C-alpha cells in the first residue's frame, strides 16, 4: 500500500495493446479512445492482469480481435478487455477466476489487491468482456 | 510462493542505472524493450542481473554492457551482453557451476523460476548471458 | 541456507514507514538510494535497523531519523542518522557489546561478515553505519 504509486491506466492499456500486438501475430488489439485516468496501485500487477486477460482471450478463446477500454467515474476506473473469441459461459465464470492459466485467477488476485473486483460479462464483439473495477484514490 | 508480479523490463532499467553508478566509465543500459511482466522473486532476479554485470566488468573487463528483454507467449528471454573477454565455448558449464568468473547465482535464480541460464557469444564481442524464464499466462 | 536475497533498500523503506506509525513526533524516512540486493538474513537485518531507530528515539531523544543505503563493488553501507543527543565517544565501541544498547546490531553485522560502527551525524546525534559485503 505504501508500495502503491501513481498509475496512468490509459497509458498502461495503450502500451499493453502495443506489446500484445508484437506477441500475437493474428491479433488486432487496440485501446479504444478513453479519457486519461490516474489511479494509485501496483503497475506490474495491473499490467499483469491485462496481459493475462489478453493471453486467455487468444490462447483459450481464439480471439483475433481484442479491445481495451477505461471508463472513469467518481468511484474509480472500469477497465474492460473485450474479445471476439468463444467467450466464457455464465456457468463457468467462477472456476475461471479460481483457475490459473481458461484461467483468470491472476486478474482476480490483482483486482483484490487494489480493493476492487473482476467480473465476466458478454462482449458485443462476440466473446468475453472481462471487467476490472478499481476504486479511485 | 513468495513470488509476485515483476516488471522485468523496469528491473533491467534500474539495474543498468544503478550499475552505471557503481562502475565508473562502464557504458551500461537497457536496450529498447517491450514491457514484460512475470511472476517471480524481484530480489533474486535483480541479484542475478547484478551478478552478471559484475562478472562482465570484474572478470571480463567489459566497458560496454547492454541489458535486454524479449517477450513471447513462452515468457521472457533476458540477456546481458558485454564487450569483454567472453567465455570460451568449452568453459560455459564450469563457469555456471562456480560462485563469483562465476555465474552459479544466476543459474540458481533461473532454476527457482523454472527457467534456464546459458552463455552465448555476444554481438558486442564478449559474453551474452541469457536467462530464459516462463511467463505467467 | 538461511541467507537469501534481500532488497536492503526496500527493507529500509518498510522500516521507516512502520517506525513513522509507532513513534509519536518522529520524522523518519529513507533518503533516495539505489536498490541494493545483498544476500542475508531478512528478519535479522530488519531487527538491526529497528533497533538502531529505537535507540535513537528512546535513548537519544531523536525527532528526526534518516535511513540511507550506498552501494559500491564491495557491498552496501547502510546508515541510520539522527538528531538526538548522540553516543559519547568513549561509549561508541562498548555500546555494541550491550543490550545506549546496540548488541543486536553488531550481532547481525557479524552474521553477515560485516561491521557496525558509530560516528557523528550531520543531523546532530549519532550516525550508525552498517557495512555489509555484497554477493558478487
Curated annotation (Swiss-Prot), chain C:
Residues 1-136 form the Histidine kinase domain. It is found in: Cell membrane. Autophosphorylated. It comes from the Bacteria. Member of the two-component regulatory system PrrB/PrrA that is involved specifically in early intracellular multiplication of Mycobacterium and is essential for its viability. Functions as a sensor protein kinase which is autophosphorylated at a histidine residue and transfers its phosphate group to the conserved aspartic acid residue in the regulatory domain of PrrA. In turn, PrrA binds to the upstream promoter regions of target genes including itself to positively regulate their expression. This is Sensor-type histidine kinase PrrB. The chain holds residues 299 to 446 of 446 of the full protein.
